[PDB]
Amino acid sequence: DDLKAQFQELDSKKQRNNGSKDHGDGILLIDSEIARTYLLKNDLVKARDLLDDLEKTLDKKDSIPLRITNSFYSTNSQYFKFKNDFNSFYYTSLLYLS
Amino acid sequence: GEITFDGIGGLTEQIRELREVIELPLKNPEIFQRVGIKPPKGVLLYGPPGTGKTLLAKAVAATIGANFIFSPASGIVDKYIGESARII
Amino acid sequence: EGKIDEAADILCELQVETYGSMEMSEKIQFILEQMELSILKGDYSQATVLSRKILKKTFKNPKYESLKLEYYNLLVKISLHKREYLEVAQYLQEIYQTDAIKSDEAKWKPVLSHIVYFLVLSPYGNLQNDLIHKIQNDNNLKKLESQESLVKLFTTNELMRWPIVQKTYEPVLNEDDLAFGGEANKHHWEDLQKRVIEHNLRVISEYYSRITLLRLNELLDLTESQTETYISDLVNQGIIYAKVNRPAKIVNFEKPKNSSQLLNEWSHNVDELLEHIETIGHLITKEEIMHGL
Amino acid sequence: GDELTRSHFNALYDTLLESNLCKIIEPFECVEISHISKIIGLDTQQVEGKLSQM
């Protein structure tokens, strides 16, 4: 909460596309960590509400390496695990393993 | 601006005749659509000379401000080949 | 005082005489007032004419708080007497994406469960696949997924669990709360069984070539006379094309294909093979980089 | 009650009968002739005479 996105982290610093690999900023990574914070602790109601903003951000803006995709698939891997649908969880784990 | 609604005074009974066929349809054309009557297009001005029939044309140009065109009878009669029909 | 016609007669001559669409919030009140008196009078055709005039005027005009009050009732009340469910889902979906100040983030979500159920009573539609990808439909109320799970069962319908649900669980079926409000058990179930039978008959025409009459009675759970009743009705409506063979006690669901139609798809197959050959042709050079490495 | 319009409905007896057969022939061909007479409520020879007329 003390950082969030584009408050304390963004002044003179460029955009490295969050924390997926090596160096990075805290803009899109904290939004992803909060999505997995309530997912592994609280219920799945508040987890998907902030997950859609992360999914629409990845589809709108991405980068060349797959470092961001694997970090995004790790969020959905834990989301479908607690559910009763194993068909969507099966396809989700395939993208995370690749 | 030279002649205004004050200089055309005395015609007040006949001044409201033009306001209904000019000022009324241009300001609020939807009134004729509610009743269903068609907006009048042409308006005829006749009578004895010197009663201010020409002043009615100058009084509207200095008030409404819309673009007007003076079309005298003898200005369009220039003839070469079918010229008067083209000028109209 | 309990006077209906006396209040409607004085306002009947006014509805055309009201305004030239000058006032904004006032015009909404008078036009929607006669619609309330016409419904209580027992004639919904009088309010139908007023509904077409007010809808085109407010199409480009945004709706304020004092407007949408009456758009949640008078619009869906006319379709109730008409018993037409294709128009029911149209007005309920139109109020979704609007400003939605009166639409709650809690109470309004179970309303969508009725909207999905209303598509079942209607002859399918183009709005069924649009509600599948909705985010609010996959969360919160579990009945949202229950009615959505039935959407994926349209093509796969075996009618095994359909008479089970119709005899056991009827949360949105015979009891309505946030949409219709409920009328009677026979009103909602009249067109309910007609559509469920139509769900299987559409699949058979697109899948099964022919089925015996004894097998149709096991699925649809009808008699010999009741089986051909719903089948013959869909033929006259230009939906299902099937030839019932009485001596063989079967029904031919395969549509007849002429000589030109069989050769038509053959031309597409030849052009399709050339597309696969074209694809394979460019994959040899592309994958050659890994071979020559 | 009107004898002038009565001649029209007498001609519609054969017209509406042929129109009622359209609802019977809805499942194309391969229907039973005896099953047709039970729906329309006419004799077998009466139905076979009207089917051959169309």
Short mmCIF file of C-alpha atoms in Angstrom, two decimals:
data_model
loop_
_atom_site.label_atom_id
_atom_site.label_comp_id
_atom_site.label_asym_id
_atom_site.label_seq_id
_atom_site.Cartn_x
_atom_site.Cartn_y
_atom_site.Cartn_z
CA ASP A 1 0.00 0.00 0.00
CA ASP A 2 2.91 2.39 0.61
CA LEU A 3 4.08 1.89 -3.00
CA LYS A 4 1.14 0.73 -5.18
CA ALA A 5 1.69 1.71 -8.86
CA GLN A 6 3.23 4.92 -10.25
CA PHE A 7 3.43 6.81 -6.96
CA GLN A 8 6.75 6.38 -5.16
CA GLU A 9 8.28 4.14 -7.84
CA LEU A 10 7.92 6.53 -10.81
CA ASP A 11 9.75 9.84 -10.85
CA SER A 12 12.80 9.82 -13.15
CA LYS A 13 12.74 6.07 -13.80
CA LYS A 14 11.76 4.33 -17.04
CA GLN A 15 9.47 1.29 -17.44
CA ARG A 16 11.13 -2.15 -17.25
CA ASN A 17 7.75 -4.00 -17.33
CA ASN A 18 7.41 -4.87 -13.62
CA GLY A 19 9.44 -7.58 -11.87
CA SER A 20 9.17 -10.66 -14.10
CA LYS A 21 12.92 -11.18 -14.51
CA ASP A 22 16.15 -9.50 -13.32
CA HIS A 23 15.74 -5.75 -12.65
CA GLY A 24 12.37 -4.04 -12.85
CA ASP A 25 9.98 -1.50 -11.39
CA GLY A 26 7.04 -1.89 -9.03
CA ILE A 27 4.24 -0.62 -11.27
CA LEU A 28 2.69 -3.80 -12.68
CA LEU A 29 4.35 -6.23 -10.25
CA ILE A 30 2.62 -5.01 -7.08
CA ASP A 31 -0.73 -5.23 -8.87
CA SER A 32 0.15 -8.86 -9.63
CA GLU A 33 1.35 -9.61 -6.09
CA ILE A 34 -1.87 -8.25 -4.57
CA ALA A 35 -3.86 -10.50 -6.93
CA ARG A 36 -1.97 -13.51 -5.55
CA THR A 37 -2.03 -12.16 -1.99
CA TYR A 38 -5.80 -12.48 -1.57
CA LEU A 39 -5.81 -15.60 -3.77
CA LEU A 40 -3.62 -17.66 -1.42
CA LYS A 41 -5.20 -16.19 1.73
CA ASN A 42 -8.73 -14.84 1.24
CA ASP A 43 -11.42 -16.15 -1.11
CA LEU A 44 -11.38 -15.98 -4.91
CA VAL A 45 -13.98 -13.19 -5.15
CA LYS A 46 -11.58 -10.29 -4.57
CA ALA A 47 -8.73 -12.06 -6.39
CA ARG A 48 -10.31 -12.05 -9.86
CA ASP A 49 -11.53 -8.44 -9.57
CA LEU A 50 -7.90 -7.26 -9.65
CA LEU A 51 -6.85 -10.11 -11.95
CA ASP A 52 -8.92 -8.83 -14.89
CA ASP A 53 -7.08 -5.50 -14.86
CA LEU A 54 -3.81 -7.44 -15.00
CA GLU A 55 -5.04 -9.69 -17.82
CA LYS A 56 -6.28 -6.75 -19.90
CA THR A 57 -2.96 -4.98 -19.32
CA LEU A 58 -0.94 -7.95 -20.60
CA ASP A 59 -3.09 -8.28 -23.73
CA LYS A 60 -2.86 -4.53 -24.38
CA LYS A 61 0.86 -4.19 -23.59
CA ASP A 62 3.47 -6.96 -23.59
CA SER A 63 7.19 -7.43 -24.25
CA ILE A 64 9.44 -9.71 -26.31
CA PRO A 65 10.52 -12.24 -23.63
CA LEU A 66 8.19 -14.74 -21.99
CA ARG A 67 9.25 -13.62 -18.50
CA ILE A 68 5.96 -11.72 -18.11
CA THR A 69 3.79 -14.58 -19.38
CA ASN A 70 5.22 -17.12 -16.92
CA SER A 71 4.61 -14.69 -14.06
CA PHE A 72 1.06 -14.19 -15.37
CA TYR A 73 0.45 -17.93 -15.75
CA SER A 74 1.63 -18.42 -12.16
CA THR A 75 -1.25 -16.23 -10.97
CA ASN A 76 -3.87 -18.18 -12.92
CA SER A 77 -2.28 -21.50 -11.93
CA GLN A 78 -3.26 -20.92 -8.29
CA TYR A 79 -6.66 -19.46 -9.24
CA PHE A 80 -8.05 -22.54 -11.01
CA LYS A 81 -6.45 -24.90 -8.47
CA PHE A 82 -8.95 -24.10 -5.70
CA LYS A 83 -11.91 -24.31 -8.11
CA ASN A 84 -13.88 -27.37 -9.23
CA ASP A 85 -13.17 -26.91 -12.96
CA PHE A 86 -10.23 -29.08 -14.04
CA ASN A 87 -10.64 -28.36 -17.76
CA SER A 88 -9.62 -24.70 -17.53
CA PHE A 89 -6.98 -25.64 -14.94
CA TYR A 90 -5.52 -28.18 -17.37
CA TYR A 91 -5.03 -25.66 -20.19
CA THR A 92 -3.70 -23.09 -17.71
CA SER A 93 -0.97 -25.43 -16.44
CA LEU A 94 0.16 -26.18 -20.01
CA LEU A 95 1.00 -22.52 -20.68
CA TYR A 96 2.77 -22.25 -17.31
CA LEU A 97 4.93 -25.32 -17.98
CA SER A 98 5.99 -24.19 -21.46
CA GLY B 1 -28.08 50.35 -40.17
CA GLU B 2 -30.26 53.34 -41.02
CA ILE B 3 -33.99 52.58 -40.89
CA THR B 4 -35.23 50.65 -37.86
CA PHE B 5 -38.54 49.46 -36.40
CA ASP B 6 -39.08 52.96 -34.99
CA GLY B 7 -38.96 54.68 -38.39
CA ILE B 8 -41.50 52.29 -39.93
CA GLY B 9 -43.95 53.15 -37.17
CA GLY B 10 -47.60 53.60 -37.96
CA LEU B 11 -47.56 50.29 -39.87
CA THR B 12 -47.62 48.30 -36.60
CA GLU B 13 -50.89 46.65 -37.62
CA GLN B 14 -49.19 45.48 -40.83
CA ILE B 15 -45.76 44.91 -39.24
CA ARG B 16 -46.89 41.78 -37.38
CA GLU B 17 -47.90 40.35 -40.77
CA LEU B 18 -44.24 39.99 -41.75
CA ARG B 19 -43.15 38.76 -38.31
CA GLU B 20 -45.42 35.72 -38.68
CA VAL B 21 -44.11 34.78 -42.15
CA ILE B 22 -40.45 35.65 -41.47
CA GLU B 23 -39.51 35.97 -37.79
CA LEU B 24 -41.86 33.19 -36.65
CA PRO B 25 -40.76 30.33 -38.98
CA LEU B 26 -37.05 31.16 -38.68
CA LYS B 27 -36.97 31.47 -34.88
CA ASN B 28 -39.26 28.51 -34.07
CA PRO B 29 -40.05 26.36 -37.13
CA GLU B 30 -41.45 23.58 -34.92
CA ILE B 31 -44.66 25.55 -34.25
CA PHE B 32 -45.91 24.91 -37.79
CA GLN B 33 -45.11 21.21 -37.37
CA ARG B 34 -47.26 20.88 -34.24
CA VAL B 35 -50.41 22.22 -35.89
CA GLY B 36 -49.44 20.69 -39.24
CA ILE B 37 -49.64 23.80 -41.44
CA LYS B 38 -46.99 24.33 -44.08
CA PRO B 39 -44.64 27.31 -43.64
CA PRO B 40 -45.53 30.08 -46.10
CA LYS B 41 -42.89 30.63 -48.78
CA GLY B 42 -43.87 33.66 -50.86
CA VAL B 43 -45.33 36.90 -49.51
CA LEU B 44 -46.91 39.59 -51.68
CA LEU B 45 -46.64 43.31 -50.91
CA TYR B 46 -48.99 45.61 -52.82
CA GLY B 47 -50.63 48.99 -52.39
CA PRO B 48 -50.25 52.66 -53.25
CA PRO B 49 -46.69 53.93 -53.73
CA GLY B 50 -44.89 55.75 -50.96
CA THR B 51 -46.37 53.78 -48.05
CA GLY B 52 -43.04 52.27 -46.97
CA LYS B 53 -43.21 48.93 -48.78
CA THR B 54 -39.51 49.26 -49.64
CA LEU B 55 -38.67 50.27 -46.06
CA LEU B 56 -39.94 46.86 -44.94
CA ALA B 57 -36.98 45.31 -46.77
CA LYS B 58 -34.38 47.59 -45.16
CA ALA B 59 -35.84 47.26 -41.66
CA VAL B 60 -35.42 43.47 -41.62
CA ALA B 61 -31.83 43.57 -42.89
CA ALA B 62 -30.74 45.82 -40.00
CA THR B 63 -32.36 43.62 -37.31
CA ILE B 64 -32.47 39.88 -38.12
CA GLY B 65 -29.00 40.01 -39.67
CA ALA B 66 -29.48 37.02 -41.97
CA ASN B 67 -27.96 37.11 -45.45
CA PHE B 68 -30.38 38.78 -47.86
CA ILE B 69 -30.39 39.25 -51.63
CA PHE B 70 -31.99 42.26 -53.32
CA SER B 71 -33.44 41.19 -56.69
CA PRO B 72 -34.82 44.13 -58.70
CA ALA B 73 -37.08 43.49 -61.66
CA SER B 74 -34.81 45.35 -64.10
CA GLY B 75 -31.52 43.87 -62.90
CA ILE B 76 -32.13 40.32 -64.14
CA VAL B 77 -33.47 41.36 -67.58
CA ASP B 78 -30.01 41.36 -69.17
CA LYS B 79 -30.33 39.25 -72.32
CA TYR B 80 -27.71 37.56 -74.47
CA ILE B 81 -28.99 34.04 -75.12
CA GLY B 82 -31.49 32.81 -72.53
CA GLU B 83 -29.68 34.93 -69.95
CA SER B 84 -32.61 36.07 -67.79
CA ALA B 85 -33.66 32.45 -67.23
CA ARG B 86 -30.14 31.53 -66.07
CA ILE B 87 -29.72 34.49 -63.70
CA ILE B 88 -32.86 33.48 -61.80
CA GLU C 1 -61.62 6.58 -5.79
CA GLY C 2 -61.03 3.48 -7.92
CA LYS C 3 -61.71 5.10 -11.31
CA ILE C 4 -59.72 3.81 -14.29
CA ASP C 5 -61.47 4.91 -17.48
CA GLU C 6 -62.31 8.34 -16.04
CA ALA C 7 -58.62 9.10 -15.46
CA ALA C 8 -57.50 7.72 -18.83
CA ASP C 9 -60.07 9.59 -20.94
CA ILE C 10 -58.89 13.04 -19.83
CA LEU C 11 -55.25 12.14 -20.55
CA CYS C 12 -56.01 10.26 -23.79
CA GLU C 13 -56.52 13.42 -25.86
CA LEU C 14 -53.47 15.08 -24.27
CA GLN C 15 -50.82 12.49 -25.20
CA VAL C 16 -50.55 13.81 -28.76
CA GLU C 17 -51.02 17.42 -27.58
CA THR C 18 -48.30 17.37 -24.91
CA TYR C 19 -45.12 18.90 -26.31
CA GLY C 20 -42.91 19.32 -29.36
CA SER C 21 -40.11 17.61 -27.41
CA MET C 22 -38.98 20.88 -25.80
CA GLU C 23 -39.02 20.02 -22.09
CA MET C 24 -36.69 17.23 -20.97
CA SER C 25 -37.63 15.84 -17.56
CA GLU C 26 -41.29 16.84 -17.97
CA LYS C 27 -41.81 15.06 -21.31
CA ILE C 28 -40.74 11.76 -19.73
CA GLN C 29 -43.48 12.00 -17.08
CA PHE C 30 -46.53 12.64 -19.28
CA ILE C 31 -45.69 10.08 -21.98
CA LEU C 32 -45.09 7.32 -19.42
CA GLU C 33 -48.20 8.25 -17.40
CA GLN C 34 -50.72 7.14 -20.03
CA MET C 35 -48.90 3.81 -20.33
CA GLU C 36 -49.75 3.09 -16.69
CA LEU C 37 -53.44 3.86 -17.24
CA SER C 38 -53.62 1.88 -20.49
CA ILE C 39 -52.32 -1.28 -18.82
CA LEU C 40 -54.82 -0.95 -15.97
CA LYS C 41 -57.53 -0.37 -18.59
CA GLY C 42 -56.84 -3.81 -20.08
CA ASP C 43 -55.36 -2.80 -23.45
CA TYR C 44 -51.60 -2.93 -24.07
CA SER C 45 -51.84 -1.70 -27.68
CA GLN C 46 -52.43 1.89 -26.55
CA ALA C 47 -49.14 1.94 -24.62
CA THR C 48 -47.28 0.27 -27.50
CA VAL C 49 -47.66 3.32 -29.75
CA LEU C 50 -46.37 5.62 -27.00
CA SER C 51 -43.42 3.29 -26.38
CA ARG C 52 -42.16 3.74 -29.95
CA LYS C 53 -42.36 7.54 -29.75
CA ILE C 54 -40.51 7.89 -26.43
CA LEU C 55 -37.80 5.35 -27.32
CA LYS C 56 -36.55 7.16 -30.43
CA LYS C 57 -36.45 10.50 -28.57
CA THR C 58 -34.38 9.17 -25.64
CA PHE C 59 -32.05 7.13 -27.88
CA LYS C 60 -29.48 9.93 -28.18
CA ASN C 61 -30.50 11.61 -24.89
CA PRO C 62 -28.90 10.37 -21.66
CA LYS C 63 -31.24 9.09 -18.95
CA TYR C 64 -31.16 10.84 -15.58
CA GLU C 65 -32.26 9.57 -12.16
CA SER C 66 -35.89 10.64 -12.64
CA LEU C 67 -36.12 8.86 -16.03
CA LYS C 68 -35.11 5.20 -15.59
CA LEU C 69 -37.66 4.79 -12.76
CA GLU C 70 -40.39 3.74 -15.20
CA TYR C 71 -38.18 2.06 -17.82
CA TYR C 72 -37.76 -1.02 -15.59
CA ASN C 73 -41.50 -1.84 -15.73
CA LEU C 74 -43.52 -0.37 -18.61
CA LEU C 75 -41.00 -1.65 -21.17
CA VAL C 76 -41.13 -5.27 -19.95
CA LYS C 77 -44.84 -5.19 -19.04
CA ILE C 78 -46.01 -4.88 -22.66
CA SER C 79 -44.04 -7.98 -23.65
CA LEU C 80 -45.68 -9.90 -20.80
CA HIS C 81 -49.15 -9.73 -22.36
CA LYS C 82 -47.68 -10.43 -25.80
CA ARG C 83 -45.97 -13.60 -24.47
CA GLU C 84 -42.98 -12.82 -26.71
CA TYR C 85 -39.69 -13.66 -24.99
CA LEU C 86 -37.42 -12.44 -27.80
CA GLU C 87 -38.13 -8.83 -26.79
CA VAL C 88 -37.89 -9.54 -23.05
CA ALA C 89 -34.12 -10.09 -23.11
CA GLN C 90 -33.61 -7.03 -25.34
CA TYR C 91 -34.79 -4.43 -22.82
CA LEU C 92 -33.18 -6.19 -19.86
CA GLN C 93 -29.78 -6.20 -21.59
CA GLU C 94 -30.11 -2.57 -22.75
CA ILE C 95 -30.22 -1.33 -19.13
CA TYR C 96 -26.97 -3.17 -18.30
CA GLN C 97 -24.26 -1.05 -19.94
CA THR C 98 -25.95 2.29 -19.15
CA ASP C 99 -24.80 4.60 -16.33
CA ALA C 100 -26.28 2.00 -13.94
CA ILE C 101 -26.59 4.24 -10.88
CA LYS C 102 -29.71 2.32 -9.83
CA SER C 103 -27.97 -0.97 -10.70
CA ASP C 104 -26.43 -2.42 -7.54
CA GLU C 105 -23.14 -4.29 -7.39
CA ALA C 106 -24.91 -6.93 -5.27
CA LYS C 107 -28.69 -7.01 -5.73
CA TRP C 108 -28.51 -6.64 -9.52
CA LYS C 109 -26.25 -9.65 -10.14
CA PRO C 110 -28.93 -12.34 -9.48
CA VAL C 111 -31.16 -10.49 -11.97
CA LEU C 112 -28.84 -11.75 -14.73
CA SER C 113 -29.79 -15.32 -13.78
CA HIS C 114 -33.31 -14.62 -15.05
CA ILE C 115 -32.00 -13.01 -18.25
CA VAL C 116 -30.08 -16.19 -19.09
CA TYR C 117 -33.17 -18.26 -18.26
CA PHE C 118 -35.36 -16.06 -20.48
CA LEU C 119 -33.27 -17.03 -23.52
CA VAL C 120 -34.36 -20.65 -22.98
CA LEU C 121 -38.06 -19.76 -23.28
CA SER C 122 -37.28 -17.85 -26.51
CA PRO C 123 -36.50 -19.57 -29.84
CA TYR C 124 -32.72 -19.46 -29.22
CA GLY C 125 -31.23 -16.11 -30.30
CA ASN C 126 -28.03 -14.25 -31.06
CA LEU C 127 -27.62 -13.07 -27.44
CA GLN C 128 -26.87 -16.50 -25.94
CA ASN C 129 -23.15 -16.59 -26.78
CA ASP C 130 -22.68 -13.00 -25.59
CA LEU C 131 -23.55 -13.86 -21.97
CA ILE C 132 -21.04 -16.73 -21.83
CA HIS C 133 -17.95 -14.49 -21.90
CA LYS C 134 -19.36 -12.03 -19.35
CA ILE C 135 -17.22 -11.68 -16.23
CA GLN C 136 -20.10 -11.08 -13.81
CA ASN C 137 -21.80 -14.28 -15.03
CA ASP C 138 -18.92 -16.52 -13.91
CA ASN C 139 -18.76 -15.23 -10.31
CA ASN C 140 -20.92 -14.41 -7.28
CA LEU C 141 -24.28 -16.25 -7.54
CA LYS C 142 -23.83 -19.93 -8.36
CA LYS C 143 -27.15 -19.98 -10.24
CA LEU C 144 -25.45 -17.78 -12.84
CA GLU C 145 -23.22 -20.73 -13.75
CA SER C 146 -26.09 -23.22 -13.42
CA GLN C 147 -28.10 -21.47 -16.14
CA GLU C 148 -24.88 -20.96 -18.10
CA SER C 149 -24.01 -24.66 -17.81
CA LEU C 150 -27.33 -25.38 -19.52
CA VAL C 151 -26.22 -23.22 -22.46
CA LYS C 152 -23.37 -25.63 -23.21
CA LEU C 153 -25.95 -28.44 -23.00
CA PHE C 154 -27.96 -27.21 -26.00
CA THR C 155 -26.09 -29.32 -28.56
CA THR C 156 -25.23 -32.13 -26.12
CA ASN C 157 -28.76 -32.42 -24.68
CA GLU C 158 -29.62 -36.05 -23.92
CA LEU C 159 -32.79 -35.08 -21.97
CA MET C 160 -31.59 -37.26 -19.08
CA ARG C 161 -31.40 -34.56 -16.39
CA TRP C 162 -33.90 -32.13 -17.95
CA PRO C 163 -37.07 -33.83 -16.60
CA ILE C 164 -35.21 -34.25 -13.29
CA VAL C 165 -34.67 -30.50 -12.88
CA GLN C 166 -38.18 -29.67 -14.12
CA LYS C 167 -39.62 -31.94 -11.39
CA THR C 168 -37.25 -30.87 -8.59
CA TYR C 169 -35.29 -27.59 -8.78
CA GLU C 170 -37.25 -24.55 -10.02
CA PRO C 171 -35.55 -21.52 -8.43
CA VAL C 172 -36.11 -19.19 -11.41
CA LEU C 173 -38.75 -21.33 -13.14
CA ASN C 174 -42.06 -21.20 -11.24
CA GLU C 175 -40.97 -18.47 -8.79
CA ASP C 176 -39.84 -15.07 -10.07
CA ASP C 177 -38.66 -12.22 -7.86
CA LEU C 178 -36.37 -9.60 -9.42
CA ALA C 179 -37.59 -9.85 -13.03
CA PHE C 180 -41.18 -10.94 -13.66
CA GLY C 181 -42.33 -11.30 -10.05
CA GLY C 182 -44.30 -14.47 -10.83
CA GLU C 183 -47.77 -15.16 -12.18
CA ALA C 184 -48.76 -18.84 -12.08
CA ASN C 185 -47.18 -22.27 -12.31
CA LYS C 186 -48.87 -23.00 -15.66
CA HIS C 187 -47.85 -19.69 -17.26
CA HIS C 188 -44.08 -20.21 -17.15
CA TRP C 189 -44.30 -23.98 -17.69
CA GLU C 190 -46.50 -23.66 -20.80
CA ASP C 191 -43.66 -22.57 -23.10
CA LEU C 192 -41.00 -24.26 -20.95
CA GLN C 193 -41.68 -27.82 -22.12
CA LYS C 194 -42.16 -26.62 -25.70
CA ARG C 195 -38.61 -25.25 -25.85
CA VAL C 196 -36.94 -28.20 -24.11
CA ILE C 197 -38.48 -30.53 -26.69
CA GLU C 198 -37.25 -28.13 -29.38
CA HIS C 199 -33.74 -28.33 -27.89
CA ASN C 200 -33.40 -32.00 -28.81
CA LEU C 201 -35.26 -31.79 -32.13
CA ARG C 202 -32.82 -29.17 -33.41
CA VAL C 203 -29.85 -31.36 -32.47
CA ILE C 204 -31.38 -34.42 -34.17
CA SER C 205 -31.87 -32.55 -37.45
CA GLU C 206 -28.21 -31.47 -37.41
CA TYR C 207 -26.83 -34.79 -36.13
CA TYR C 208 -29.01 -37.91 -36.36
CA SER C 209 -29.80 -39.09 -39.88
CA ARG C 210 -32.90 -41.06 -38.87
CA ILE C 211 -34.48 -42.25 -35.62
CA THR C 212 -37.24 -44.78 -34.99
CA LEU C 213 -40.54 -43.62 -33.52
CA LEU C 214 -40.04 -45.93 -30.53
CA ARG C 215 -36.77 -44.16 -29.68
CA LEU C 216 -38.28 -40.66 -29.92
CA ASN C 217 -40.79 -41.62 -27.21
CA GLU C 218 -37.96 -42.64 -24.87
CA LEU C 219 -36.12 -39.31 -25.19
CA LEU C 220 -38.90 -36.73 -25.50
CA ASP C 221 -41.02 -38.80 -23.05
CA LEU C 222 -44.17 -38.46 -25.18
CA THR C 223 -46.66 -40.75 -26.91
CA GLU C 224 -47.03 -41.59 -30.60
CA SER C 225 -49.45 -38.71 -31.21
CA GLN C 226 -47.58 -36.23 -28.99
CA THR C 227 -44.21 -36.93 -30.65
CA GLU C 228 -45.30 -35.88 -34.15
CA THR C 229 -47.17 -32.87 -32.73
CA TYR C 230 -44.08 -30.81 -31.90
CA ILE C 231 -42.16 -32.16 -34.90
CA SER C 232 -44.77 -31.15 -37.48
CA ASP C 233 -45.06 -27.68 -35.93
CA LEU C 234 -41.36 -26.95 -36.48
CA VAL C 235 -41.60 -28.01 -40.14
CA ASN C 236 -44.29 -25.44 -40.97
CA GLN C 237 -42.24 -22.71 -39.25
CA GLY C 238 -39.24 -23.29 -41.53
CA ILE C 239 -36.87 -24.51 -38.81
CA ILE C 240 -36.59 -28.32 -38.80
CA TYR C 241 -36.78 -30.28 -42.06
CA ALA C 242 -37.60 -33.94 -41.46
CA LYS C 243 -39.51 -36.65 -43.33
CA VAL C 244 -41.52 -38.92 -41.03
CA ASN C 245 -41.70 -42.48 -42.38
CA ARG C 246 -44.74 -44.20 -40.86
CA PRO C 247 -44.41 -47.72 -42.39
CA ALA C 248 -40.79 -47.99 -41.24
CA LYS C 249 -41.82 -46.25 -37.97
CA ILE C 250 -38.86 -43.87 -38.37
CA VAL C 251 -38.26 -40.22 -39.25
CA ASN C 252 -35.74 -39.12 -41.89
CA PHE C 253 -33.88 -36.05 -40.63
CA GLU C 254 -31.32 -35.94 -43.46
CA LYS C 255 -32.05 -33.07 -45.83
CA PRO C 256 -32.11 -34.06 -49.53
CA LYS C 257 -29.10 -32.87 -51.52
CA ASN C 258 -29.32 -32.27 -55.27
CA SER C 259 -26.65 -33.18 -57.81
CA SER C 260 -25.31 -29.61 -57.92
CA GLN C 261 -25.06 -29.32 -54.13
CA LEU C 262 -23.00 -32.51 -53.84
CA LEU C 263 -20.61 -31.25 -56.53
CA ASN C 264 -20.55 -27.81 -54.89
CA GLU C 265 -18.93 -29.04 -51.67
CA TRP C 266 -16.62 -31.20 -53.80
CA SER C 267 -15.22 -28.03 -55.37
CA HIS C 268 -14.59 -26.59 -51.90
CA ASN C 269 -12.81 -29.80 -50.90
CA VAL C 270 -10.47 -29.58 -53.90
CA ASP C 271 -9.71 -25.94 -53.05
CA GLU C 272 -9.26 -26.95 -49.41
CA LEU C 273 -6.66 -29.59 -50.29
CA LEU C 274 -4.74 -26.95 -52.23
CA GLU C 275 -4.74 -24.82 -49.07
CA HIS C 276 -3.18 -27.65 -47.05
CA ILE C 277 -0.64 -28.28 -49.82
CA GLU C 278 0.10 -24.54 -49.82
CA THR C 279 0.57 -24.65 -46.04
CA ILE C 280 2.85 -27.70 -46.15
CA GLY C 281 4.80 -26.14 -49.02
CA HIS C 282 5.89 -23.17 -46.91
CA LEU C 283 6.52 -25.26 -43.78
CA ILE C 284 9.30 -27.23 -45.49
CA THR C 285 11.46 -24.15 -46.05
CA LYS C 286 10.60 -22.67 -42.65
CA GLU C 287 11.50 -25.84 -40.73
CA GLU C 288 14.58 -26.35 -42.93
CA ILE C 289 16.52 -23.89 -40.74
CA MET C 290 16.42 -26.36 -37.84
CA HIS C 291 17.31 -29.24 -40.19
CA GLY C 292 20.33 -27.54 -41.76
CA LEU C 293 21.64 -26.27 -38.42
CA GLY D 1 -78.09 -16.22 -41.67
CA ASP D 2 -77.27 -14.44 -44.94
CA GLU D 3 -77.98 -16.48 -48.07
CA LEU D 4 -75.75 -14.27 -50.23
CA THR D 5 -72.60 -15.04 -48.22
CA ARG D 6 -73.68 -18.66 -47.67
CA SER D 7 -72.60 -19.58 -51.20
CA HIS D 8 -69.05 -18.45 -50.36
CA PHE D 9 -68.64 -20.67 -47.29
CA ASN D 10 -70.05 -23.58 -49.30
CA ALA D 11 -67.17 -23.08 -51.74
CA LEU D 12 -64.73 -22.73 -48.83
CA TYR D 13 -65.68 -26.24 -47.67
CA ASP D 14 -63.42 -27.71 -50.36
CA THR D 15 -60.90 -24.86 -50.04
CA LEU D 16 -60.45 -25.14 -46.27
CA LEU D 17 -60.36 -28.93 -46.61
CA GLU D 18 -57.41 -28.68 -49.00
CA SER D 19 -55.92 -26.11 -46.61
CA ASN D 20 -56.39 -28.48 -43.67
CA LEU D 21 -54.57 -31.20 -45.62
CA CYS D 22 -51.54 -28.90 -45.73
CA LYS D 23 -51.25 -29.29 -41.95
CA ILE D 24 -51.51 -33.07 -42.34
CA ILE D 25 -48.84 -33.33 -45.07
CA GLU D 26 -46.41 -31.27 -42.98
CA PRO D 27 -44.24 -34.42 -42.37
CA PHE D 28 -43.82 -34.68 -46.19
CA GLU D 29 -44.91 -38.09 -47.58
CA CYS D 30 -45.09 -41.58 -46.01
CA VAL D 31 -48.25 -40.94 -43.98
CA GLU D 32 -51.14 -43.33 -43.42
CA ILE D 33 -54.38 -42.70 -45.29
CA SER D 34 -56.41 -44.13 -42.40
CA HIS D 35 -54.50 -41.86 -40.01
CA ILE D 36 -55.45 -38.85 -42.14
CA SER D 37 -59.18 -39.64 -41.97
CA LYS D 38 -59.00 -39.88 -38.17
CA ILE D 39 -57.58 -36.36 -37.84
CA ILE D 40 -59.94 -34.69 -40.32
CA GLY D 41 -62.90 -36.83 -39.22
CA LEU D 42 -64.12 -38.01 -42.62
CA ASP D 43 -64.72 -41.33 -44.35
CA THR D 44 -61.80 -43.15 -45.97
CA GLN D 45 -63.37 -42.92 -49.43
CA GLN D 46 -64.08 -39.22 -48.84
CA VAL D 47 -60.43 -38.49 -48.02
CA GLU D 48 -59.03 -40.58 -50.89
CA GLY D 49 -61.28 -38.67 -53.29
CA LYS D 50 -60.02 -35.28 -52.11
CA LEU D 51 -56.34 -36.31 -52.09
CA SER D 52 -56.57 -37.42 -55.73
CA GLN D 53 -58.20 -34.09 -56.61
CA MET D 54 -55.22 -32.02 -55.45
#
